[PDB]
Write a protein that binds this ligand. Structure first.
Ligand SMILES: O=C(O)[C@H](Cc1ccccc1)Oc1ccc(-c2ccccc2)cc1
Ligand SMILES: O=C(O)[C@H](Cc1ccccc1)Oc1ccc(-c2ccccc2)cc1
Lengths: 260, 260
């Protein structure tokens, strides 16, 4: 039933657009900067970082880690809004909604971060700035280990050349994964996901004449994301046990884990 | 040894001032607004909230809860910086530093929030605005329950009339509490705290001729703070189990608890 699968595709796209201010279209407009309006400021050394403070909405590694922490609090609200717009979702068991969002959230953060990334760096500060990969690599040891797996993921992911209409569906599919630990009622989740998968396959055929095997490749990427989440959690766990400077400890995370 | 206890008092005061941008002196200057420069905008109904968006750095209840979430990520860094400045602290076992900060942090957030509060409301947005207690009480049910215990604590706490020099020591004493669960080496912590307690008693005698029993009253307040943290955690735990709107779930907290 393809009228329905198309209507669902559009519905997903319109909520994505409402929920997520910084889209792939916006990010690529800057990176393909014909639109010189927002030609981004390039932070490529300590010098240009220092100059860039007087023209962006801002130990450099600590700043960056806290930047990630702040971004997570914002991203959760965006993702939660979008999740609620997925037909069927708010009708699920309250505990399953929680479970699905809990595991979906970081997988989606990295999916969307890739929109801002290429092999040379990442857009920062609502696209105002471009921070160089080699600049990041030159910083304090833990920073680099954190970013490089994400870059590597993003280079392979971006070579699939998805647009925002593609991403809306992919992201919904991720949320509606019926194999999350602790799920109570798996069949209704699988039902919604099966229908989302068909909507995704059809969308990819329509939007991509320049490639085949895009659907399969994309489903492999949902597995890769689970690995990236896991490596990330584990780097943080090494820091928690071994880092001697308390300002480099996550810590808010250690508090919510143990006290809350 | 009172030259030392005074030098320590000053050392603590200077780091407090470096670590914490918004002080009690600043907050009281606004609330005793002879300095009309920053006479705060009063959000006292929905109408004045709506007008106040066009003159402050900003469902209203969700905005407020996320505001608290953002503030926590900022506060942890301030508090960690200050903790490191307390003589003896960075020489403790790494695990004990972690433990002390983990339990100290929320107790200090509420201690300092009181600086912004009176029985009629709370300073918001770096003191730019004053949000009314009765306005908060009129909002969505969970909001009110969250704030009222903090107001009640803050009214009794503020009636002790401490200044920033007093607070610096009190806060250090809190961090250096030797009864936190999981501490490895308790005696060195107790040693530093005993000396901080003397510095605190002497400070209070010198700074407060208009009251006696201030030291005792203040130590009772360290126990009260533990209750406020506990009630807070428990309200969040009720929301996690019973709230049907996912946008009203903490959730970042649920993710760090279960996945990290
Ligand atoms: O785990 C998370 O929620 C975020 C996820 C994220 C990763 C990259 C961009 C945006 C978000 O990653 C973090 C990385 C480092 C830290 C952190 C913060 C302070 C001190 C040390 C590490 C916190 C979160
Ligand atoms: O627990 C915390 O870290 C903060 C503590 C805090 C409380 C008042 C002012 C500043 C900080 O309190 C929160 C209160 C509500 C929420 C929250 C966020 C989103 C959805 C529901 C609740 C998060 C934190």
């Amino acid at each position: 039933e393809s009228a329905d699968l198309r209507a669902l595709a559009k519905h997903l796209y319109d909520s994505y657009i409402k929920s997520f201010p910084l889209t792939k279209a916006k990010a690529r407009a800057i990176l393909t900067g014909k639109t010189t309006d927002k030609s981004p400021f390039v932070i490529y050394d300590m010098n240009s970082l220092m100059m860039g403070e007087d023209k962006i909405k801002f130990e450099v590694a600590i700043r960056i880690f806290q930047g990630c922490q702040f971004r997570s609090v914002e991203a959760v609200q965006e993702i939660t809004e979008y999740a609620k717009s997925i037909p069927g979702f708010v009708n699920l068991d309250l505990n399953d909604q929680v479970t699905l969002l809990k595991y979906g959230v970081h997988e989606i953060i990295y999916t969307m971060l890739a929109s801002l990334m290429n092999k040379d760096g990442v857009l920062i500060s609502e696209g105002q700035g471009f921070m160089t990969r080699e600049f990041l690599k030159s910083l304090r040891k833990p920073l680099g280990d954190f970013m490089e797996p994400k870059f590597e993921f993003a280079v392979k992911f971006n070579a699939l050349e998805l647009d925002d209409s593609d991403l809306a569906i992919f992201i919904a599919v991720i949320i509606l994964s019926g194999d999350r630990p602790g799920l109570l009622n798996v069949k209704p989740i699988e039902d919604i996901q099966d229908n989302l998968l068909q909507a995704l396959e059809l969308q990819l055929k329509l939007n991509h004449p320049e490639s085949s095997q895009l659907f399969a490749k994309l489903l492999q990427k949902m597995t890769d994301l689970r690995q990236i989440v896991t490596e990330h959690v584990q780097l943080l766990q090494v820091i928690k046990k071994t880092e001697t400077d308390m300002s480099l400890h996550p810590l808010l995370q250690e508090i919510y884990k143990d006290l809350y």
